[PDB]
């Protein structure tokens, strides 16, 4: 996260770290959506241009974390993966269309002050909240600058941007399965997700019921925090029928 700040303790209790077993390193962010299911970006698991194709046994999920590098004894919980599910129409060839994946844990994780699931939006919450100017919150342990790495989880609040402005900011083909967020050059304020924040959540706190909903997944950007560029996020609601199909079939 570029131009963000340290998270408060328990601020994002759905935050998940995807962790490579060997070598031991951060792979991505992710989010907890139930006691057995974690949501992330498909490119965190499968990206052939970079020879990335992880299997279940390659990976761990670390839940309840705040420090990036510490083993947070008695706080974090570490889970093994039973199965990965990647969207069948995930477009790794071109533009990361449908950049979404689910991971089922081998065993349920115990909730705590530090570990708690985020809600997924329904149609009405998404329609109400996914509006230009409305701000969401992005969190992660990724790079602090485009060109180091944080001691603890970083957070930044960013406004959703009008679709024509998103489209006009890039040569990449944008789809309805994406939205973009970030400040415009004339708005002064700054901030973006960056490499290493992939797969983490873009959340919004509904003013109707005071619950946090995950509207997006960190997907892509061209550089990080560049003037005139925006961060692109997987549109969770648009892909929720697939999420529900996987959980209903394999839960």
């Amino acid at each position: 996260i570029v131009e963000g700040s340290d998270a408060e303790i328990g601020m994002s209790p759905w935050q998940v770290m995807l962790f490579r077993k060997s070598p031991q390193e951060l792979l991505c962010g992710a989010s907890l959506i139930s006691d057995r299911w974690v949501l992330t970006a498909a490119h965190c698991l499968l990206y052939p241009p970079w020879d990335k194709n992880f299997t279940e046994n390659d990976l761990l999920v670390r839940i309840g974390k705040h420090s990036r590098t510490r083993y947070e004894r008695n706080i974090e919980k570490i889970s093994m993966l039973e199965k990965i599910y990647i969207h069948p129409r995930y477009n790794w060839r071109e533009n990361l269309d449908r950049d979404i994946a689910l991971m089922k844990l081998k065993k349920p994780v115990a909730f705590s002050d530090y570990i708690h699931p985020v809600c997924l939006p329904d149609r009405e919450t998404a329609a109400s909240l996914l509006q230009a100017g409305y701000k969401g919150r992005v969190t992660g342990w990724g790079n602090l600058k485009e060109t180091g790495q944080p001691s603890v989880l970083q957070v930044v609040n960013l406004p959703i941007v009008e679709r024509p402005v998103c489209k006009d900011s890039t040569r990449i083909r944008i789809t309805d399965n994406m939205f973009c967020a970030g400040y415009k050059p004339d708005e002064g304020k700054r901030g973006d997700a960056c490499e290493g924040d992939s797969g983490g959540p873009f959340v919004m706190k509904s003013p109707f019921n005071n619950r946090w909903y995950q509207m997006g997944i960190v997907s892509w950007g061209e550089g990080c925090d560049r003037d005139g560029k925006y961060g692109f996020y997987t549109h969770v609601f648009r892909l929720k029928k697939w999420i529900q199909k996987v959980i209903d079939q394999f839960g």
Partner: peptide, 10 residues
Amino acid sequence: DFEEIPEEYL
């Protein structure tokens, strides 16, 4: 670098 995690998690 990352602090080693308990071996039980492999």
